[PDB]
Structure formats: structure tokens, C-alpha cells
């Protein structure tokens, strides 16, 4: 249970991006710029 | 317009301990049946607040200009309901803008202007005999007003003048906060009776209003209602005309609180992280029923 | 199967023109600020007209801004020499900033 | 800062539908899922909730001020039962949950 919790809770973190939700990223920023923020989110989520 | 009243003798200060009292919902987001830990401005869980016996009755009055620092918790309880508003500001004069909130039996008004507030402000009412009814025309709170940039009106949210006496003490609680150009006010209202005039029970403050007003505030003072009486020349008396009143004031601090949102989406239990080592355990474990054992709550280093 | 959109039915327009062509502009040391809220803004008009030399958006893309909602908008106004325009940007060091 | 929105864009609010996976956009917050009537109320002017994560569990309709709950729509892994290509070619699919 602990592991699962701490996995799902890691979705709340943004790992240095401007937001923790991909929907906010893709609604606020254009693809060429949102690419780097999504890169940060991808790296953080993959590591977790 | 201007009116002044002073007392040579000054009522002494008084400190009183404060229990769980003073917990408010930290965010506008909703939650339910979950334990959530968040850092925000709360008054320490067991905190020595300043209790003011503002009006006593052979009678004396208190008009203090209390300090303000990153939020304030206010509490009161009385049948007369003398308290009828607040004033906030860096200087409380025309030199800079200042905030005023006033309440009546039918509406609540809020304004931001360079008010020239008096040193002993109050709102006066008297029983007009011609109209055979109470009248309110003595706004002795301020001397002048200018540059009325921001104004707002709302309902009499908690001006309920219940006609009950005895074991029906009514408690009104408020929290004022200033964050990034927002003056945000939470409040709660509940009848409870205890030996002391502030119960140890646990309840949460709901968000009352939010004003998007940018201002620097470090001072504030209460507003009290004075019921004038027809003092004829034979009496040859004049001065304060109001019943006894008192309240409690406390200063918020940046703390981490763990709150227990119930099934109905209500918080009825919370713990302060820094209050006690046991509360540190409860916070780090994100629970209230800590099992027997030894826990690495946190870490400490001798500071330089 | 379907996509829905829900916004409050605020049938009012509050363009920023009253601030943009304000005849008098405050000094930089006394930069003017205006708060706008509770209204619908058509941001397209802002960037659809060839009337602005620099239009730089930080943390949000101008194209998508017509499909976003916000709590409040603070419009700041001042005047500076063109060479120092770049100083108005986060993370910039200079006397003006 | 996840607060009620007062500034919006020029987008007409479409009709609200329930019981089917839809791509929703409520006063700025965008997502997708099935929408239903929530089983409990918020504070008098508390307008959405959350689950253990930042994913939204409930939302208040900005048009009708009605409470609603959101659930991710039917999803899951898919596997297939195959007795071996070198013995047959039919296969039976299995949707996990
Ligand atoms: C929560 O809601 C249920 C169902 O309406 C009710 O029975 C219960 O009393 C509520 N909780 C409290 C603390 O009143
Ligand atoms: C706007 O929405 C409110 C809330 O339902 C409704 O009462 C009102 O009639 C609506 N006005 C228009 C013009 O649609």
C-alpha cells in the first residue's frame, strides 16, 4: 500500500515544471515551448 | 462630526490560553474522508492570546490599536453585541489608504479610503422619540474620507441578535489574512456555554469573503456601538453609554497543520506539527493513531 | 463521444483599451496598475492588429490565451526608452528592473 | 491558484451532458471522463474537490452552480488467450477490468 500511495502521490509533484498537470501545460503553453516542461514531467514520472 | 472620549485610568492587560480554537479551511479546494497536511498561516495550537475586557461596569472603556503581523484571529461572545466592525491600516490616517468594515442589522459595508480615523472611534445610536424607534447617525469613527478607490457591500452574515439570555452564550470567530493583494476573511458562529467564555471544543472556520485589495496593514482596532440616552441637564452627566464587552486576539504564525476532512467534507480534528513531539509523530506518519514504537520524526542540527 | 465547455454566462465585454490608449501615462518610478476582473476579454484583438512592436508572453502562449480563464488580471503601465524594453522580463538585471 | 475564475474568453458555454465519457472544460480546467451528479455538497461557494492526487474528483458547474462528480471512463489493459500459433490461429480476447 505504501509504495502504491507514494507512486500516485508523485503525480502531484511537478519536478521543476510550471505545473504538475499535463493538461495545464498543454492548455497554457504552445507545443514548441511546452515540450521542455513536458520533458521535465516525463523525466520525473519515469524516475518515480 | 468629530467626537472624543478618554479615561484617565487604563484597564490592565490580560493573557489567556487558547485551545484548538482557530482552525480554518486552508484552501478553496474540497476534500473529504482524508488526512491532509499543509503549510499555511495558523495560530499555534495552544497559544497565549490577549483577552481584552474592553467595556466594564464605575465604568471604563478600552480602545486599543493592536498590532498586526501576517494575519490575526479574533473571537468574542456577548449578548449585547457591542462589536460592530473593524478598522485596519498602516497609519489609520489620511496619509495612506486604510480598510474599514462596518456592520448593521440589515447590511455590511467594506471600504478602502484614506480615512482620518479618530483615536476613540465608535458608532452611536439613540432611541429617536419623534420616530419612536432606534436611529443611527453618529458615525464618530472617522473625521474625513477621500479617494474611495474600493467599496463592497454584503449581507449581515452573523449579525443575528438572538433574544436569549443565560446558558446561550454565542461565540463569533474571525480570521483576517493579507496575502498577495488579497484581504481574506474567514468566520464561524456557534452557541456554546462553559465556565470560561471560550470553549475548548474543536470546530472549523469557513471562508467568509475575499477582497482583491492591495494594501500594507500593520495596525487595527475594534469598532464598538454606543447607545446614547437622553441625559437631561439635571443629570449633568455625559460619556460612555454601552454595556460590558470583551474579546480575544491572537497572532497567526506559519505552521504546518494536519487536518482530518470527514466523510461529509468537514474537518473536525487537526494537529499542529511543531506543538509536541507526539504531534510531530502524527504528522510524519500522516495519522492520529500512532502505534507503539520509535519513529524518526525529523532531524536537528546545532545552528551556527 | 462529445466535448463540453462551461463558462459563467457573463455577457459583458471590458476591453483593455481604456488603459492602453490612456492619454496620460504614469512614470516608471510610479508605474500605474489597474485590476480587471468579472468580464470576458477577447485577447485576439490585442495581437491581431499590427500596432505593437514587442509582444512577449512568459509562462503562457498568446495563441491559446483566448481559451483560458483567470482569477484576476493586473495591467501595469509605464513608459521607457526602447533600448531598455528588454529589461521588462523575469530574471533580468538592470537599473530599471 | 486554483480559485474561482472571474476573467474568461469568448467561448460559448455548450450544453451539459452526463453519463458518457466527454472532454470537459470547466472555467479553464480541462480534462476527460464521465460526469454524474455528486452525492454530497461542498461549502456554500466551494466549487470543486480532489482525490488523493491532483486529479479532480468533483466540480461545481459555473453555469447552474450544480455539484457534479467526475470519474475516468471505461479503460483497462487487454490480453489475449492463444493456444499457440503452431497449433491453431483463433484467439480469445480478455479485457482486464
Ligand atoms: C453526513 O451525512 C449523512 C447523510 O446525510 C448524515 O447522516 C450525517 O449526520 C452527516 N454527518 C454529520 C457529522 O452530520
Ligand atoms: C445565466 O445563468 C444564470 C444561472 O443559471 C441564469 O439564472 C440566467 O438566466 C442566465 N442568463 C442568461 C442570459 O443566459
Describe what is shown at a glance:
Chain A: This is Spike protein S2'. This is part of a larger assembly, with four copies of chain A. Chain A has three helices and no strands.
Layout of strands and helices, then pairs:
This is part of a larger assembly, with four copies of chain A.
Chain A: H1 2-9, H2 22-28, H3 31-47
Helix pairs in contact in A: 2-3
The structure holds 2-acetamido-2-deoxy-beta-D-glucopyranose (NAG) (2 copies).
Structure description:
This is part of a larger assembly, with four copies of chain A. Helix content of chain A is 67%, strand content 0%. Chain A contains three helices and no strands. Chain A has helices at 2-9, 22-28, 31-47. Chain A binds chain D through residues 5, 8-9, 11-12, 20-21, 23, 27, and chain D through 28-31, 52-55. Strand 1 of chain C pairs parallel with strand 2 of chain D. The complex binds 2-acetamido-2-deoxy-beta-D-glucopyranose (2 copies). One 2-acetamido-2-deoxy-beta-D-glucopyranose binds at residues 263-264 of chain B. Chain D: This is Spike protein S1. Chain D: Residues 2-24 are annotated as: Disordered. Chain D: Glycans are attached at residue 86. Chain D: Disulfide bonds join 21-73.
Radius of gyration of chain A: 11 Å
Which kinds of small molecule does this entry bind, naming each only once?
2-acetamido-2-deoxy-beta-D-glucopyranose
Question: How big a fraction of the residues of chain A is strand?
Answer: under 5%
User: Level of helix content of chain A?
Assistant: 55-70%
Count of alpha and pi helical runs of chain A? 3
Largest interface: which pair? C-D, 28 and 28 residues
* Overall outline of chain A: elongated
Secondary-structure content class of chain A: mainly alpha
Q: Roughly how many Å apart are the termini of chain A?
A: 16 Å
Characterize the quaternary organization of these chains: part of a larger assembly
DSSP strand tally of chain A: 0
SSE order of chain A: HHH
Largest sheet of chain A, if any?
none
Protein name (chain B): Spike protein S1
